[PDB]
Symmetry: C3
Subunit: 252 residues, 3 copies
Amino acid sequence: MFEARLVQGSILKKVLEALKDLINEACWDISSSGVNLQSMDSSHVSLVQLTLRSEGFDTYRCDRNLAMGVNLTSMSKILKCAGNEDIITLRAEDNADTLALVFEAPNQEKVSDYEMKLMDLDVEQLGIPEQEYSCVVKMPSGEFARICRDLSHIGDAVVISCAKDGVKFSASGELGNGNIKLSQTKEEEAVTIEMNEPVQLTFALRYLNFFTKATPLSSTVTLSMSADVPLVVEYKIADMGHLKYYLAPKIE
Amino acid sequence: MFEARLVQGSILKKVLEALKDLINEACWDISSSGVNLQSMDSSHVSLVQLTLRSEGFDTYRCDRNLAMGVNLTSMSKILKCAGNEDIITLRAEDNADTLALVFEAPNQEKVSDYEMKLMDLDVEQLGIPEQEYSCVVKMPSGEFARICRDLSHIGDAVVISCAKDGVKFSASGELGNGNIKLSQTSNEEAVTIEMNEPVQLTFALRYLNFFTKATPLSSTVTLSMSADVPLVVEYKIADMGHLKYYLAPKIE
Amino acid sequence: MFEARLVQGSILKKVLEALKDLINEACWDISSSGVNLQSMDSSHVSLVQLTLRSEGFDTYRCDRNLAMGVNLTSMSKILKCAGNEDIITLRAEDNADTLALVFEAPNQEKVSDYEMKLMDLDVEQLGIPEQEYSCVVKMPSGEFARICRDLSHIGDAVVISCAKDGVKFSASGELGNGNIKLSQTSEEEAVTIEMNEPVQLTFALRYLNFFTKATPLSSTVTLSMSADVPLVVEYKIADMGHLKYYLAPKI
């Protein structure tokens, strides 16, 4: 028997917008520690990894560990029925085939109350080795979104060169080519770099533009890179957990 | 001869948005009492009933009773050419085959001036057998819109249960099911109920979502229900008249 | 070796929105006087004429006269990557097949830097002479846009009657017909007329609605007309140049 109550419902809405189009089906690993999700996209290229620790919920109770299989598109449709200021409460009986959801308003005259059909999923757990990275760029989520969205019009791949001065996003294609140079810095939204070794890597823009759907979760985004290992795009669900997107660099 | 002058042109624009897609053709009953319209939708399920009393117009003159047949899509297109703050004046001669429209600006340096071709129409006026109703829910137009719009994603029909405490909108379907519980209030935008007998009725959501296009006419909406009789969704065109939608409940 | 630097980048963004759909390909005539463009639309009905004088650029250098052929849709896509407050610098190194563009942000955190492939085009640019016109209507760009956009729902053509009192836009079609009467005024957004002779002319609304994509360049628009000659819709790129659209009246 499971019962997590989250006051910032917006978090839960924003998460499923960032995921519904990248992954159709996924397995929610519920624990006393918190709510986890780990999955690869439809086409087995990018890896998603959600962590919502139990400290971050206003109430939390989890007697048995659940492994709820969910259609993320279906779950997104239900969370559309929640206002952004609503207090969302997840609940699941022990002997269960469904997840309940209860949206309370700010006024609390209104009380929405949904029940979602679950499903069977035999997806396999994956290894996320704890790797230290050469370059670690911290920048604003919106600027990373803007950049990835813009270079899409130029080309199908972005080349992220990274030095000590700043970071450089490049792209080539039919109509021409482009270079977006961002230097280090400042207050709130600032570009900062922890750089062991210089890195240059190529990534499909198609997939980065899926990751940037998480942009509403965080003012900042962190990109972590080393050669011959997957890029980690991390959006911090502040004071609560994270949403990490992993992506394999191209070989060319 | 006919000449109604309405200062709040917006009213007339908002009306035809609420109707153009639900009914293609309709007969405008002009009278000394005011402008009326009564019609069933394309597919003979829902009944629409507009009343704009002559007290509510800033000028009003109607010598003979007219029965002007109108393509509501055509009339909508002309009212798009009116600004929201424009002063709209309807005018028609004796042996009429056309409706005039006159848009005066609030800057007063522009004067649009349209003429709309009318048409022949056969209208069998159903006796709307004015009833007293079991439940009469008054709530905010926007919340009714939100609710109907949301539950569409869950299912094809809404079940409006109504008690003394509040009102409960339910829906079932493929992905799961949902319940939106709205309670009454003490003390602008408030849920209030006049409840003779408890009522539970099912309605197609498809049609309620058509009715909610009238939402711009009024901050509040009133739902009136009794068993085995049609639901009345009433949007008040304040200090002027109303726009009522009738709908047949489903049969269990 | 061309190098124009424009502080109001927005100008350059707004221009290419007003052009990309009307003309696919066009030839940019660069000169010491400034940047010019002259072209007819895809379907050889309307004539476009851009002038950006070199006084209006914050830096300007042009050693040789260039004739850069450009895919305006491609160039539009690059200018989307510029913010509205960005400082846009055009540059071309004459032993060249490409024009570079560099957008710096006002704060200068960021410096985007693009390079666009050019193309070969048959510079078949036959000019039209500086006519004096019967009616010259000056009105707000937004109202002209509104009017053209609205009457489209009524009909496929607008009849611009013009008198001393004001100006009258008419249209007929299936559902009915309409008349928008705008009178003159006695100072920001005002309708004013220089009227030698009275004029009535018909124009395809389809094309005027393409012209009104220039509306973001200017608070006002000027319509110039005489019988049996093309209508000039002029959007002033203030303190800098203009963007003129020419259109043949119906018969």
